From a paper:
The M271CH3 NMR chemical shifts reveal a unique molecular signature for pharmacological or genetically driven activation and inhibition that is not able to be resolved by other biophysical methods. We show hydrophobic interaction in this region plays an important role in regulating STING activity.
Both compounds have similar potency for inhibiting and eliciting IFNβ in human PBMCs, respectively (IC50diABZI-i = 49 ± 8 nM, 1 donor | EC50diABZI-a1 = 117 ± 72 nM, 3 donors). Comparisons between STING bound to diABZI-i and diABZI-a1 do not reveal any significant differences in lid formation to explain inhibition or activation. Another well-reported feature of cGAMP-STING binding is the shortening of the apical wing distance between STING monomers. Major upfield shifts in both proton (0.721 ppm) and carbon (1.667 ppm) dimensions were also observed for A277CH3 which is in close proximity to M271 upon binding to diABZI-a1 but not for diABZI-i.
Author numbering:
A (entry chain A): 153 to 228, 238 to 317, 323 to 338
B (entry chain B): 153 to 185, 194 to 226, 238 to 303, 305 to 316, 322 to 336
The structure:
Amino acid sequence: MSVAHGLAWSYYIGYLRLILPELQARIRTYNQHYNNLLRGAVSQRLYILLPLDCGVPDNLSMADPNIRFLDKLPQQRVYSNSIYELLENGQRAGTCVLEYATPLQTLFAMSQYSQAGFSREDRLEQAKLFCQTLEDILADAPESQNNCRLIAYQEPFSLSQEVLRHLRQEEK
Amino acid sequence: MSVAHGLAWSYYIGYLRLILPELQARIRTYNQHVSQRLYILLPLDCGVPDNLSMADPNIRFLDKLPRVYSNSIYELLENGQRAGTCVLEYATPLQTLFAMSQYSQAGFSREDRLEQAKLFCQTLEDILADAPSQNNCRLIAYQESFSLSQEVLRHLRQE
Ligand SMILES: CCn1nc(C)cc1C(=O)Nc1nc2cc(C(N)=O)cc(OC)c2n1C/C=C/Cn1c(NC(=O)c2cc(C)nn2CC)nc2cc(C(N)=O)cc(OC)c21
């Protein structure tokens, strides 16, 4: 329905269209001049986490102990994008720029506030339609699809393995 | 109906609920070491310019109010004299409604933009009426001779 439609368009206009054109250059700059020489290159593309239950925690490292914060990307009013290391059996298995799609926090809060007239069933339906609309916007957005990946997932699960699966899919 | 609903809720959850509880203390700190309340400009035609001072010469930037949130303090001039001073800013979700009316893929008409701008104001007013936020902010809705400085001064004198 139209709630998800407006949120996906807002997320694109007010944020993704402003950060994705220069993201590739920032990632290259970090790999060439800031990344520790004993580390693997940070993967290209912004990985956007889309929990379908709209459960967006405040700390990304507290959600999963295998997602460890590493550094902030060189800055692009201003935007702070974080680089995370994904651990598998203690070893570093991948490194990427990761963050939650914040409009799903709004969908969660709307399902909690009575005045919003928004059910928990409406939340799940609108979360899926938010992902659909955002995927359609990014499919034809100039310099945005090849610079980001949408990670949609449902929970009853390892969030670190969910991100690693998408990273290995791009490599294969 | 629902585009405006989602934007008003997003503006509250992702921004106003995080800045309005501590705004009164930041305003007091500036005065001790500018009127209370955040004045949110809501142009119903969704014409949000990038520079506030360029929109009206009688609205002059004075200083920034000390996640990082930067709010700007402005002086409102009347016949050259300083007639009021307040923390002022545009409701940025109206810039999204304007852009949606411009992008073909959004399937959003200019008529849909005016309807959704009014419903955004209505939903935001209802949220703020019962948010634990109302006494720390005021909504200035207007349709653009028109003077934006006089529009803000009218609300300041009403309080
Ligand atoms: C608007 C795009 N959007 N739409 C949906 C749906 C979700 C998002 C979204 O995810 N936005 C987003 N993510 C970011 C991540 C980073 C990063 N990685 O560091 C940096 C960012 O920009 C600084 C990010 N932004 C931009 C805005 C962030 C919050 N914010 C707002 N927000 C709104 O007005 C608004 C309008 C509607 C509708 N909903 N909201 C609430 C979000 N006004 C602010 C004013 C000031 C100030 N006074 O200086 C400071 C702010 O926050 C520091 C302000």
